[PDB]
């Protein structure tokens, strides 16, 4: 395990609003098999103190769902702890390489393993940025084979009262 | 019969059901306890006007 630098002079009101997931880099089993249950995943973000309040949205078996979490800040700008809500413990979230207008690369960590995500404000991404994500995966010592490019269409937002996990 | 309970995992992006409380231990004083899911509803409405 190792340290990667969070976004220097980060601003939470610039990360706010909607985002769409392009890809995930991880050694995790449930992507290298069962990957047909990768689905079109998007975020709404709103700042709450130095922490970021996060809603993820996804289709679970044709029904649109919402997932609610705090990126509770560690007291270091651009680092957050996922509020330790369940028996898996806590996940560290580090915003690694971004511009608020187009793209974000995140690192997420548990059990001494790094993992990474690429997000965009709108559906396509520039090949240099996507190559940057591949290099961040290689620099995380993961293979490009451990990169999973999520469904490029059919996203959803605003799930009903009964389709939100309320995990916080 | 109700163990099914949703969980997200933020690392590797999965939505999965908890695998918690799948079984309960039965006390010796209980012969059978059965976790059968039923509903029945019955509704009657009557209106009379003169």
Swiss-Prot record, chain A:
Keywords linked to the UniProt accession: Complement alternate pathway, Complement pathway, Cytolysis, Disulfide bond, Immunity, Innate immunity, Membrane, Membrane attack complex, Pyrrolidone carboxylic acid, Retinol-binding, Secreted, Signal, Target cell membrane, Target membrane
Keyword Secreted listed: yes
A GO BP entry: complement activation, classical pathway
S-S bonds: 64-156
Gene Ontology cellular component terms for the protein in this record: blood microparticle; extracellular exosome; extracellular region; membrane attack complex; plasma membrane
GO MF annotations, alphabetized: retinol binding
Superkingdom classification of source: Eukaryota
Coiled coil: none
Predominant localisation class: secreted
Activity regulation description: Membrane attack complex (MAC) assembly is inhibited by CD59, thereby protecting self-cells from damage during complement activation. MAC assembly is also inhibited by clusterin (CLU) chaperones that inhibit polymerization of C9.
Keyword Disulfide bond listed: yes
Location in or out of the cell: Secreted; Target cell membrane
Family label: Belongs to the calycin superfamily. Lipocalin family.
Functional note: Component of the membrane attack complex (MAC), a multiprotein complex activated by the complement cascade, which inserts into a target cell membrane and forms a pore, leading to target cell membrane rupture and cell lysis. The MAC is initiated by proteolytic cleavage of C5 into complement C5b in response to the classical, alternative, lectin and GZMK complement pathways. The complement pathways consist in a cascade of proteins that leads to phagocytosis and breakdown of pathogens and signaling that strengthens the adaptive immune system.
Quaternary organization: Heterotrimer of 3 chains: alpha (C8A), beta (C8B) and gamma (C8G); the alpha and gamma chains are disulfide bonded. Component of the membrane attack complex (MAC), composed of complement C5b, C6, C7, C8A, C8B, C8G and multiple copies of the pore-forming subunit C9.
Stated name of the protein: Complement component C8 gamma chain
Organism: Homo sapiens
Lineage of source species: Eukaryota, Metazoa, Chordata, Craniata, Vertebrata
Gene name in the database record: C8G
UniProtKB/Swiss-Prot annotation, chain B:
Compartment(s) of residence: Secreted; Target cell membrane
Free-text function comment from the UniProt entry: Component of the membrane attack complex (MAC), a multiprotein complex activated by the complement cascade, which inserts into a target cell membrane and forms a pore, leading to target cell membrane rupture and cell lysis. The MAC is initiated by proteolytic cleavage of C5 into complement C5b in response to the classical, alternative, lectin and GZMK complement pathways. The complement pathways consist in a cascade of proteins that leads to phagocytosis and breakdown of pathogens and signaling that strengthens the adaptive immune system.
Record's subunit section: Heterotrimer of 3 chains: alpha (C8A), beta (C8B) and gamma (C8G); the alpha and gamma chains are disulfide bonded. Component of the membrane attack complex (MAC), composed of complement C5b, C6, C7, C8A, C8B, C8G and multiple copies of the pore-forming subunit C9.
Protein family according to the UniProt entry: Belongs to the complement C6/C7/C8/C9 family.
Disease entry from the Swiss-Prot or TrEMBL record: Complement component 8 deficiency, 1: A rare defect of the complement classical pathway associated with susceptibility to severe recurrent infections, predominantly by Neisseria gonorrhoeae or Neisseria meningitidis.
Protein name: Complement component C8 alpha chain
Gene: C8A
Residues of the full protein shown: 183 to 232 of 584
